[PDB]
Amino acid sequence: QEALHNCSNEHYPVLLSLLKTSCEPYTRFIHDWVYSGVFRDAYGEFMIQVKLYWTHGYVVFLKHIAHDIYVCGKTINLLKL
Amino acid sequence: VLMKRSITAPLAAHISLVNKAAVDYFFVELHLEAH
Amino acid sequence: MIHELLLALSGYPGSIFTWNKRSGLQVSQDFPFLHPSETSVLNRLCRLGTDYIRFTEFIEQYTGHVQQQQGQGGLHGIYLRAFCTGLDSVLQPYRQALLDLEQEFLGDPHLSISHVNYFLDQFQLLFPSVMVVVEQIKSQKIHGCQILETVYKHSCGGLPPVRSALEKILAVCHGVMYKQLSAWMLHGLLLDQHEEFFIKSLKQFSLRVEILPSYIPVRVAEKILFVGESVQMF
């Protein structure tokens, strides 16, 4: 929200460079669940977290693509079975 | 402009492959259509 | 007398040039070193420094005092901060003049008041004209796109230096409107929060016809609104 608040001033490249590195471990986290579907978090910054195979949990950055990741990992994890 | 959708286009192409494989995996191999 | 006046004009109040809000800077007028002969020169120089203190005070008060947050364009808001940002950059030659002055006093310490009045004559008319242009904006709580019109009408004057000077700040405020418009027409993404940039699927947008700047007629704004609604729809 700090990006959309101020984007036409001198603090625009510094804030963009801050947000671009504040999401760098997040891309590794997503870079797991796109190809394998193995849980990685011990920080509480991840919202895809730990019957009929829907007993893992799921709860601003774009929530529109997160649920897609939650199901795109679980297919690869289904072919492990 | 603030957009994070430029990365979604090199990602949705794999999202679609995974989804199509998931629906195909039931019917041609586990034979839910026969049941 | 020498460094003291440059101290006062820079925006830190002097002890001889006592900072008041109702008389600005005023020379102490009680020394047996001063006289009607030199007093008038000091008052004429003090006009520019009083305006400069007010300028820096307003710019500081409204640049970098919040995360841009609700906010109104008379107090908060992107347009007013853009005005302060442009106002600092037009004031850069005055800073250069004061810095140059101290170097000349270092080269020879015997220079008179006529030299500094003579060099600073070109600012002597430029500061009073722009002062009321910003004063009307501050007093009336002018919100939204009307700020651009308010400085725009007095940059339709008959004084060339004031025209160039006000036109620079107006370019700065256009920049923030244009930065928000460069997404919304082509994506639909507003980048403006709690201010007006004169446009607000199948609907959900409407033209703010009342706020729309006078040099931007209603016809072009309808094409803008059409483009935004369409890109939102598909």
From Swiss-Prot, chain A:
Lineage: Eukaryota, Metazoa, Chordata, Craniata, Vertebrata
Disease per UniProt entry: Microcephaly and chorioretinopathy, autosomal recessive, 1: A syndrome characterized by microcephaly, cognitive impairment, underdeveloped retina and choroid, and epilepsy in some patients. The more anterior parts of the retina, near the periphery and pars plana, have a grayish hue and diminutive vasculature similar to retinopathy of prematurity. Visual impairment becomes evident during the first year of life.
Residues of the full protein shown: 507 to 607 of 1819
Cellular localisation: Cytoplasm, Cytoskeleton, Microtubule organizing center, Centrosome
Family: Belongs to the TUBGCP family.
Assembly mode: Component of the gamma-tubulin ring complex (gTuRC) consisting of TUBGCP2, TUBGCP3, TUBGCP4, TUBGCP5 and TUBGCP6 and gamma-tubulin TUBG1 or TUBG2. TUBGCP2, TUBGCP3, TUBGCP4, TUBGCP5 and TUBGCP6 assemble in a 5:5:2:1:1 stoichiometry; each is associated with a gamma-tubulin, thereby arranging 14 gamma-tubulins in a helical manner. Gamma-tubulin at the first position is blocked by TUBGCP3 at the last position, allowing 13 protafilaments to grow into a microtubule.
Protein name: Gamma-tubulin complex component 6
Signal peptide: none
Physiological role: Component of the gamma-tubulin ring complex (gTuRC) which mediates microtubule nucleation. The gTuRC regulates the minus-end nucleation of alpha-beta tubulin heterodimers that grow into microtubule protafilaments, a critical step in centrosome duplication and spindle formation.
From Swiss-Prot, chain B:
Protein known as: Gamma-tubulin complex component 6
Disorder named in the UniProt entry: Microcephaly and chorioretinopathy, autosomal recessive, 1: A syndrome characterized by microcephaly, cognitive impairment, underdeveloped retina and choroid, and epilepsy in some patients. The more anterior parts of the retina, near the periphery and pars plana, have a grayish hue and diminutive vasculature similar to retinopathy of prematurity. Visual impairment becomes evident during the first year of life.
Known partners and oligomeric status: Component of the gamma-tubulin ring complex (gTuRC) consisting of TUBGCP2, TUBGCP3, TUBGCP4, TUBGCP5 and TUBGCP6 and gamma-tubulin TUBG1 or TUBG2. TUBGCP2, TUBGCP3, TUBGCP4, TUBGCP5 and TUBGCP6 assemble in a 5:5:2:1:1 stoichiometry; each is associated with a gamma-tubulin, thereby arranging 14 gamma-tubulins in a helical manner. Gamma-tubulin at the first position is blocked by TUBGCP3 at the last position, allowing 13 protafilaments to grow into a microtubule.
Subcellular location: Cytoplasm, Cytoskeleton, Microtubule organizing center, Centrosome
Organism of provenance: Homo sapiens
Chain's role: Component of the gamma-tubulin ring complex (gTuRC) which mediates microtubule nucleation. The gTuRC regulates the minus-end nucleation of alpha-beta tubulin heterodimers that grow into microtubule protafilaments, a critical step in centrosome duplication and spindle formation.
Family: Belongs to the TUBGCP family.
Section covered of the full-length record: 1482 to 1516 of 1819
Curated annotation (Swiss-Prot), chain C:
Compartments, record wording: Cytoplasm, Cytoskeleton, Microtubule organizing center, Centrosome
Coiled-coil region list: none
Tissue: Ubiquitously expressed.
Subunit structure: Component of the gamma-tubulin ring complex (gTuRC) consisting of TUBGCP2, TUBGCP3, TUBGCP4, TUBGCP5 and TUBGCP6 and gamma-tubulin TUBG1 or TUBG2. TUBGCP2, TUBGCP3, TUBGCP4, TUBGCP5 and TUBGCP6 assemble in a 5:5:2:1:1 stoichiometry; each is associated with a gamma-tubulin, thereby arranging 14 gamma-tubulins in a helical manner. Gamma-tubulin at the first position is blocked by TUBGCP3 at the last position, allowing 13 protafilaments to grow into a microtubule.
Role summary: Component of the gamma-tubulin ring complex (gTuRC) which mediates microtubule nucleation. The gTuRC regulates the minus-end nucleation of alpha-beta tubulin heterodimers that grow into microtubule protafilaments, a critical step in centrosome duplication and spindle formation.
Disease note: Microcephaly and chorioretinopathy, autosomal recessive, 3: A disorder characterized by congenital microcephaly and chorioretinal dysplasia associated with poor vision and nystagmus. Variable ocular anomalies include microphthalmia, retinal folding, retinal detachment, optic nerve hypoplasia, absence of retinal vessels, round areas of chorioretinal atrophy, and attenuated electroretinogram. Most patients have mild developmental delay and mild learning difficulties.
Family per similarity comment: Belongs to the TUBGCP family.
Protein's recorded name: Gamma-tubulin complex component 4
Species of the source: Homo sapiens (Human)
Lineage, highest ranks first: Eukaryota, Metazoa, Chordata, Craniata, Vertebrata
